[PDB]
Every structure is written in C-alpha cells, then in structure tokens.
C-alpha cells in the first residue's frame with residue numbers, strides 16, 4: 469500500500485507531464501497521494517498562469533465577509549458579517565493597513581503560533597467565493613477554467629445526462645482570514661492555485677480517518693451537533709493543531725506559496741488561514757474514483773448549508789433516498 473502514513477506529498481511534474489491533467493491526478497494517486505487528503509503540485513519552470521497581475525485592482529468584491537469568532541483560541545466558530553462592496557485595490561489597501569496587516573514575525577512557524585494564539589481577538593475581512601478566473605485563455609495546461617466538468621464525468625461513468633455547470637471561484641485574503649474545517653460539496657476533489665501574494669497554511673485529516681474528526685467536532689460543538697447531523701457542512705468550526713494532537717486526531721500541515729497548486733481529495737477534511745494579502749482560484753472536480761464517495765457523502769438538511777444549483781442533480785442521481793429531505797433544506 470503506497471503512503472501508509474498518509475503524508476502530504478509534493479510533486480514536480482515536467483512540462484510533458486503537465487499536459488494531461490486527468491492522467492497526472494491518476495499518477496499521484498498511484499503513488500498514494502490521496503491518502504493524505506491533500507497534495508502540493510509545483511508547476512514546471514516553463515509554465516505560467518498569466519503574463520502579469522498588474523491589472524487586477526478593478527475586480528469587484530461585491531460582498532466582503534468580516535469573519536467574527538466566538539469560543540476559545542483553539543476551539544471556536546466564526547460567522548460571516550456582510551460588508552459593503554469594494555474593489556480589489558480597495559481591499560488590498562485595507563489588508564495592508566495597520567489594523568489588518570501581518571505582524572512582524574521570524575518565519576512561518578512563528579506566524580502560525582501567533583495565528584492560533586490571537587485569531588479570535590480580531591475580525592479579518594475575506595473576499596470569498598467570487599465567480600471568475602485569472603488564468604489567461606492561452607494557458608493550456610492546468611487552467612482551472614478549462615477543466616472537464618463534473619457533469620460530463622458523471623455522464624461518462626454512469627450514462628446519465630444532467631443539468632448544471634462547474635466554474636471557478638476567486639478568493640481574496642488577508643492576515644488571519646480563515647477557512648473552517650470541511651470537505652467539499654458531495655465530497656468532491658478541489659484544486660486551488662495561489663495566484664499572487666502571501667502564503668496560505670493548510671491542515672488536513674486523511675480521508676480514512678475523517679470520522680475521527682467528526683466525532684471530536686460533535687464533542688466540542690455539542691449544541692451544533694444536536695442541530696444538525698452534518699454540521700461541518702456549515703463551514704464555521706475551527707479546531708487548532710494543539711487541540712487535535714491532545715485528542716489523538718491524525719492530521720498534517722503544509723504551507724502553500726504563490727505559484728503553487730494544492731489538490732484536496734474526496735473526503736479529505738481541511739482548514740487553514742492566509743498569511744497576508746493574497747489571491748487564490750479554486751474549483752471542484754471529479755474522477756471515476758470519486759463516484760463512490762459521492763454516493764456516501766453526508767448531507768446537511770437543516771437549512772444552514774445552502775449550496776449551488778448544480779448539487780441538485782448530484783443528490784438526485786447518486787442519493788435518491790436522501791433527495792426529498794435534502795431539497796427541503798434547500799427550500
């Protein structure tokens with residue numbers, strides 16, 4: 469069995485190997501990369517996402533989200549307060565202001581310590597989930613707006629033809645902006661490219677151990693657990709590495725830098741934070757190996773999770789017994 473300790477693997481494809489996306493995902497899996505829940509892919513030196521970022525300040529962040537925490541430093545939830553629209557140029561200036569800028573620090577480890585000590589005492593503003601792409605149309609390799617669609621994968625594997633679309637999303641971050649513990653919708657894969665700026669630190673639980681994290685989360689957030697049998701789908705709960713280690717939960721960590729891809733694998737729980745002003749692009753995707761995870765994915769039906777249009781078909785075809793309850797939570 470490859471990668472039996474479920475370590476995060478780092479890949480350096482050559483320019484030839486970078487041509488065929490599906491083939492390279494299958495290669496990484498042949499080496500056991502999925503067992504970690506997360507892999508890093510460093511593009512070949514000949515590749516570029518686009519020519520320059522000199523022209524991005526005019527993008528609009530229609531609904532910036534202020535991430536307000538409640539709890540203790542290692543076990544907290546966050547809620548998103550909507551703020552007035554601002555441009556990327558306005559948001560970058562805000563990120564760099566004295567109130568929001570990254571503090572002086574020695575190295576990534578010192579910064580990580582400061583994040584977990586102090587996160588709860590601040591409310592950073594995140595420009596998340598903005599439909600769009602920063603890949604040049606002429607970039608043919610690993611262009612996240614030119615991937616094979618999840619609908620097409622389901623049609624090819626299962627023969628059924630469904631509505632829905634699959635497009636990328638932009639994320640503008642600042643110091644302390646936070647992504648809560650989650651798996652993807654329908655336990656899909658994700659791929660994330662850090663276009664520019666400061667790093668992103670990730671934490672991940674191996675898919676084979678995801679239910680250990682779920683059981684800890686039910687203990688740590690007991691009112692939330694009574695509210696919903698899949699409350700991690702709400703994407704609001706944080707648990708620190710120190711608390712994970714105290715409770716024996718297997719996990720790994722890695723820091724992504726600008727120019728690097730990360731892939732999350734089906735049912736790989738992940739969480740993390742941004743080091744300073746940055747911009748990432750991410751999208752969900754499927755492979756044949758995903759289908760069994762899609763069939764078994766948990767679902768929130770309490771109303772909180774609310775998701776895209778395109779998840780309807782996935783539930784309807786893969787989980788017909790659950791469909792009626794889940795759709796009530798959508799409506």
Ligand SMILES: O=C(O)CNC(=O)C(=O)O
Nearest residue numbers: 639647658659660748750
């Ligand atoms: O970058 C972020 O804030 C969150 N991204 C992801 O959870 C992902 O790419 O799957």
Ligand SMILES: [Mg+2]
Nearest residue numbers: 523524526527
């Ligand atoms: Mg612009």
Ligand code: NI
Nearest residue numbers: 651652658732
């Ligand atoms: Ni994710």
Ligand SMILES: [Zn+2]
Nearest residue numbers: 696768770772
């Ligand atoms: Zn719920």
